[PDB]
Structure 1
Amino acid sequence: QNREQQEELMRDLAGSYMGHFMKPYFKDKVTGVGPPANEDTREKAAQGIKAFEELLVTKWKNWEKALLRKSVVSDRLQRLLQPKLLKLEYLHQKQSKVSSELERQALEKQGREAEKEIQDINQLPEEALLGNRLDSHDWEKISNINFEGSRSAEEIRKFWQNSEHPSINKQEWSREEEERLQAIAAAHGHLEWQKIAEELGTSRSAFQCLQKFQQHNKALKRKEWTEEEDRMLTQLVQEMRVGSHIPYRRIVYYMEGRDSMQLIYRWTKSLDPG
């Protein structure tokens, strides 16, 4: 019995996690990859059912924004330099084997012109180098070299083009600007926010205009309770209760145009049976 206890104790010393199973429960110990996706998985992907990792959203950090800016600048510099650098290399190669002098001097003059063009490109200002939030940069390279893979190419492209470009006015809104936005939304309709942003004058994205309108809107919530809505709230609460815990966020989304605070107040002050 004592030696069995000792064996138990050594296997305690030789014993050993949950993480090794999580998504690939079956996985190889030489390659570390699980079994191939089931045909059901392929069919699910075909129907465009986003997986949990595909719907995973992470906030854009400030250092990420600065890294994006720097990477885009470097990308544009490289893309504008590679052509002229290659031209200069070709001119040098031709100079190496020209078998002539006057042609060699002409090639030297062309190379000097190319070097001047390269210098001009190098000293280009940041404003003219960034672009116009609609030119095609190498967004996929940024996802690999600049970013270590934490951001996909499409995510970076959308963030740069729609939000983080300098041509998007990120400054705080003004009262006159807000009033103009409200008037344009009312007259032009709340369904063409691209044309609203274009007509707003200031360089703004349709998303920003819609966000500001919603945050200052007054028809977003119903703002008045009705008997039918009260009955719906009571039924939903009685259905989704587990005791004294009433999760109002989950109740809200069966209610139309309501917030959790409104339901909390309504069920605590008026619809409470007590």
Structure 2
Amino acid sequence: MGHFMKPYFKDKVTGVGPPANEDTREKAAQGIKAFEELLVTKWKNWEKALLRKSVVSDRLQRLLQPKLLKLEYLHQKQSKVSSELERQALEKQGREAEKEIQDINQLPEEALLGNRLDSHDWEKISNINFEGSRSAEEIRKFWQNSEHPSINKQEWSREEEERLQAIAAAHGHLEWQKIAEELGTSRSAFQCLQKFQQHNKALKRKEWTEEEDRMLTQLVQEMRVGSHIPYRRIVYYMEGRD
């Protein structure tokens, strides 16, 4: 019974489906998205922990690779070369590279993490360290905007909330990047807007308006059968509800 779930037809030996159809190809060329794209999984603590591990590992390899490549090239040259003074100079270079790799080994994880806007091989991280389960750009956004330690993850202070409200009014509730910059607590535009919307009287309304009531009544009468109405789905059409 359960064998017939989507896709309805699936290849018996490989499980693949038919190639892209003409209608599907045109729709893709028109940029029409699919419903499967809306499926997103919550960041469990393991996902974050191994993202952190991946970032530290990436930075470690980035720092080490030039040093160890230099050391290995130097050792190859020392092995092939017979000149004594040049051999001693190459040996000294190898000792320097050894000391450099040792102090990099001794560097702390925080120094390895570096700044928020540092460069990383997000593509390689994605497809080799999480096997492509999450997209490289998605991982980049998550890290740089929420997970990197420089992000202000602390709870909002009451003074911070009051100043946020005041400067949001000052900025006309627009350009929330400038709002966050003026707040001065290293907050992001998205954090500021989410916070304001969660305590904005204009969005969440206890009162009512003529257009909201009219459209609620219209949708209710069009859809309602007996006692049932889409209480929480009417919110798509009118603004300021659940």
TM-score greater than 0.5 by the shorter chain: yes
Moved more, 184-193 or 113-122: 184-193
Paired with 1:65 and 1:201, the residues of 2 have a C-alpha distance of 27
Deviation of 1:143 after TM superposition, in Å, equals 2.8
* TM-score using structure 1 length: 0.81
Segment drifting more, 228-237 vs 173-182: 228-237
Worse overlay, 232-241 or 184-193: 184-193
More displaced 10-residue stretch of structure 1: 114-123 or 221-230: 221-230
Alpha carbons of structure 1 residues 22 and 153: separation in structure 2 relative to 1, 3 Å: farther
SS in 2 for 1:43: helix
Q: Using the TM superposition, name which of 128-137 and 59-68 deviates more.
A: 128-137
Percent identical among aligned pairs is 100
Q: Closer, same or farther in 2 for the Cα pair 1:213/1:237, shift >3 Å?
A: same
Residues 127-184 of structure 1 show CA distances to partners (whole Å, capped at 9, x for unaligned) of: 2211322222122333344324432222211111111111101111101111222222
The answer on whether the counterparts of 2:71 and 2:97 sit within 8 Å (CA) in structure 1 is yes
CA 55–222 in structure 1, closer or farther in 2 if over 3 Å, else same: same
Aligned position for 2:153 = 170
Q: After TM superposition, give the deviation of residue 19 of structure 1 in Å.
A: 4.5
| C-alpha contact 1:25 1:34 (8 A) present in aligned 2 | no
Asked if the contact 1:132/1:167 (under 8 Å) is kept, the reply is yes
Q: 1:95 to 1:258 in 2, by over 3 A?
A: same
Q: Which runs of 5+ in 2 are unaligned?
A: none
The 3 A distance-change label for structure 1 pair 228 and 35 is: closer
Alignment partners' CA distance in 1, 2:239 and 2:63: 53
The answer to whether residue 217 in structure 2 is matched with residue 228 in structure 1 is no
Instruction: Give me the TM-score of the superposition, normalised by structure 2.
Output: 0.91
1:240–1:251: 8 Å Cα contact kept in structure 2?
no
Note the C-alpha offset of 1:113: 0.8
In structure 1, stretches of 5+ residues that fail to align are 1-17, 260-274
Task: Choose 153-162 or 140-149, whichever is displaced more.
Answer: 140-149
Q: Which moved more, 1:164-173 or 1:194-203?
A: 194-203
By how many angstroms is 1:117 displaced?
1.2
Q: Which moved more, 1:159-168 or 1:229-238?
A: 229-238
Please state how far the C-alpha of 1:197 moved relative to its aligned partner.
2.0
- Residue 206 (structure 1) shift: 1.3
Count of paired positions: 242
Q: 1:196 to 1:127 in 2, by over 3 A?
A: farther
Rg (Cα) greater in structure: 1
Q: Distance in 1 between matches of 2:234 and 2:146?
A: 33
Partners of 2:203 and 2:239 within 8 A in 1? no
Whole-Å separation in 1 of the counterparts to 2:209 and 2:194: 28
**In 2, Cα distance between equivalents of 1:170 and 1:233:** 39
- Please give the per-residue CA displacement for 1:77-130, whole angstroms capped at 9, x wherever unaligned: 012111111011000011011221111111111111111111122222222211
In structure 1, how many angstroms separate the alpha carbons of the residues matched to 2:225 and 2:124?
A: 50
Contact 2:164 2:196 in 1 (8 A): yes
Contact 1:163–1:205 at 8 Å: present in 2 too?
no
| Matches of 1:158 and 1:83, distance apart in 2 | 28
Q: What is the rounded CA distance, in whole Å, between the counterparts of 1:169 and 1:228 in structure 2? A: 40
- The 1-side partners of 2:2 and 2:106 are apart by 51
Once the 2 structures are TM-superposed, how far is the Cα of residue 225 of structure 1 from its aligned partner?
Answer: 2.3
Displacement of 1:227:
4.4
Q: How large is the RMSD of aligned CA atoms in angstroms? A: 1.9
Residue 102 and residue 46 in structure 1: after superposition, are their counterparts in 2 closer, same or farther (change >3 A)?
same
More displaced 10-residue stretch of structure 1: 148-157 or 30-39: 148-157
